[PDB]
Design brief:
Length: 288
């Protein structure tokens, strides 16, 4: 139930969340993540202002007629390295610890995959650069990012080797529906969740943001983010961190990496997280 029933967290703190996680009551964790978890990897949040019309470059209709702008922008914005953050590897540890039900991400940078989350673990709600497809319905040939990368840097508009149609990265352009997988997984996963871990998202983009309202009423929800988010808009279920009726929502405010480190430390996972990150970062740095 809500604030009227006995709550699962013994206190509304990171410390309370850690005790809950290591209790028998917490078995399945859903992570909801956004651009905030990749900024420390040197991937800007293109929605953060600090990072025909400008909106045309993401519209599917305009893209299919005039793809050159998008791919030009793709070359400029292409990350120089793909080194996932502490936050990403924290989710890998959740997976290793047998706690990860699913990671729903708004990001298209593939860092979840690089950090060791598998396709089954992931719902890429806004799509991904990881794969691309020929746009012709009768073909739909799939191309890997290695192939798409070469096209982007060579400044060759990617065309299908089978039919010479345009090849589009599997990101959701404006005008496109979210993937069916998003809705199918949402329907099953939120029946099963013991803990929501919301990291690096302001929960302002729909329908992704509405996911927090899909949790059972008893399910604790931990926000790790630079700013509080998810609270109902006074003008326009929602997060309640601070009222007298607060019973399950906890906000840890700071960088996602530092919050995840703090949580790992409480869990006795800090050494494991340190070792995993330094090993994987070393491996990525040593790619030849
Ligand atoms: C080029 C590249 C390659 C790889 C592997 N990673 C990157 S990450 C860096 C970067 O910013 N890459 C990059 C390059 C171009 C555009 C965008 C982001 O802007 C877009 C583009 C297309 C669609 C959308 N749409 C949505 O997000 C959406 C749609 N519906 N809803 C509800 C939301 C946004 C990001 N970049
Ligand atoms: Zn084709």
């Amino acid at each position: 139930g809500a604030s009227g029933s006995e709550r699962l967290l013994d206190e509304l703190t990171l410390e309370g969340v850690a005790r809950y996680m290591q209790s028998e009551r917490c078995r399945r964790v859903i992570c909801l993540v956004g651009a905030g978890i990749s900024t420390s990897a040197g991937i800007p949040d293109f929605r953060s202002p600090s990072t025909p019309y400008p909106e045309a470059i993401f519209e599917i209709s305009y893209f299919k007629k005039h793809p050159e702008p998008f791919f030009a922008l793709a070359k400029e914005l292409y990350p120089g390295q793909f080194k996932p953050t502490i936050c990403h590897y924290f989710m890998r540890l959740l997976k290793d610890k047998g706690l990860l039900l699913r990671c729903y991400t708004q990001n298209i940078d593939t860092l979840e995959r690089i950090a060791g989350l598998e396709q089954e673990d992931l719902v890429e709600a806004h799509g991904t650069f990881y794969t691309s497809h020929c746009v012709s319905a009768s073909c739909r040939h799939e191309y890997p990012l290695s192939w798409m990368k070469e096209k982007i840097f060579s400044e060759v508009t990617p065309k299908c080797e089978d039919c010479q149609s345009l090849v589009k990265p599997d990101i959701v352009f404006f005008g496109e529906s979210l993937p069916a997988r998003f809705f199918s997984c949402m329907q099953s996963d939120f029946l099963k969740v013991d803990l929501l871990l919301v990291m690096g998202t302001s929960l302002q983009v729909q329908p992704f943001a509405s996911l927090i309202s899909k949790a059972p009423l008893s399910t604790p929800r931990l926000l790790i983010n630079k700013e509080k988010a998810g609270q109902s808009d006074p003008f326009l279920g929602g997060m309640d961190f601070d009222s007298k009726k607060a019973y399950r929502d906890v906000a840890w405010l700071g960088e996602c990496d530092q919050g995840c480190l703090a949580l790992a430390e409480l869990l006795g996972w800090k050494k494991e997280l340190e070792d995993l990150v330094r090993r994987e970062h070393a491996s990525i740095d040593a790619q030849s």
